DNA sequence: CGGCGGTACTG
DNA sequence: CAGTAC
DNA sequence: GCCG
């Protein structure tokens with residue numbers, strides 16, 4: 001775009017973070033939409049009226065946008081609770097969300113050392129905690145490619161016809177990635193089955209996977225792996241890796257889901273529901289509603305899902321937000 | 328005013 | 339079930 | 345927070 005309201009969005013984002021770490025998620029959702037709407041606007045907002053006219057912006061947000069626009073900052077930023085930056089710190093641990101972070105706060109911890117030395121930690125959070133720094137860093141797009149190639153090469157050693165694709169921010173074209181998302185399927189509709197057993201064992205053998213966060217290996221029909229990998233060679237960081245294995249008939253919906261963004265996926269699914277459909281990572285489904293399951297519409301490609309939702313195909317680089325348009 | 332995406336693990 | 343995650 |  002070119003954010004024409006940069007000075008405004010900066011400040012609303014601080015505020016938004018604050019609700020977000022305090023656990024006030026709907027409020028934080030509201031801020032995020034407004035903020036995207038400001039960023040995409042053709043010009044600096046100049047009037048309260050013009051602010052309210054924007055979908056995503058109502059009275060309370062227009063008051064703020066205006067106050068910032070005239071007076072040059074936002075009072076409310078100097079009343080944010082002091083606990084917020086601790087709650088953010090604790091929430092940046094993988095596996096600890098706002099509840100854990102609040103529990104730790106009421107136990108009086110205020111730093112990661114208070115966490116290590118005294119807090120009770122789930123298995124996941126202990127892993128989250130020891131890799132705190134590495135997991136906060138975004139990786140270059142090129143390290144993501146090598147991670148994906150590792151997973152793919154290990155998969156094709158078992159079956160050369162297996163399809164592997166990196167999704168997430170990578171597929172949306174970004175320069176850096178918070179974590180790598182790999183989608184595996186097989187066009188024969190069948191040989192995706194039992195992959196995780198073999199694939200995980202192989203990736204552990206040569207030391208690439210260093211920890212597992214979610215991986216239900218008791219289940220032969222396991223569909224997801226969330227864990228931690230590390231490319232070989234000196235000084236490499238530990239990275240988050242997510243792998244999903246799906247049947248080929250689910251490929252377009254899984255691809256769409258895994259490409260995201262999160263906000264994009266939410267809006268798509270909200271749209272589907274407005275049309276008596278249901279959109280998931282597994283399928284797009286018609287005639288919903290206790291509720292009734294409705295039937296799967298076949299969707300051999302992502303274009304089919306867009307078409308059935310009455311939208312034009314959206315290129316992966318333009319899937320940051322649904323309500324963001326224009327070539 | 329109530330709804331705000333739909334689903335998969337963990338414990 | 340609540341919590342966290344994708 | 346905003347929307348229907």
Ligand SMILES: Nc1ccn([C@@H]2CS[C@H](COP(=O)(O)OP(=O)(O)OP(=O)(O)O)O2)c(=O)n1
Pocket residue numbers: 167168169170174176177178179180181257258259260261262265266344
């Ligand atoms: N709450 C969520 C989270 C993710 N998603 C979907 C499924 S996984 C895909 C990408 O999500 P990630 O959290 O890896 O974000 P991105 O890849 O966009 O960015 P970075 O990893 O931060 O580079 O989005 C979702 O539908 N709902």
Ligand SMILES: [Ca+2]
Pocket residue numbers: 051052053054055056057058
């Ligand atoms: Ca509006």
Ligand SMILES: [Ca+2]
Pocket residue numbers: 090091092093094095096097
């Ligand atoms: Ca966390």
Ligand SMILES: [Ca+2]
Pocket residue numbers: 152163164165166
């Ligand atoms: Ca590939």
Ligand SMILES: [Ca+2]
Pocket residue numbers: 168179180181242
């Ligand atoms: Ca991810």
Ligand SMILES: [Ca+2]
Pocket residue numbers: 167168169170177178179180181
């Ligand atoms: Ca990602």
Ligand SMILES: [Ca+2]
Pocket residue numbers: 212214215216217
């Ligand atoms: Ca396990």
Ligand SMILES: [Ca+2]
Pocket residue numbers: none
């Ligand atoms: Ca309310």
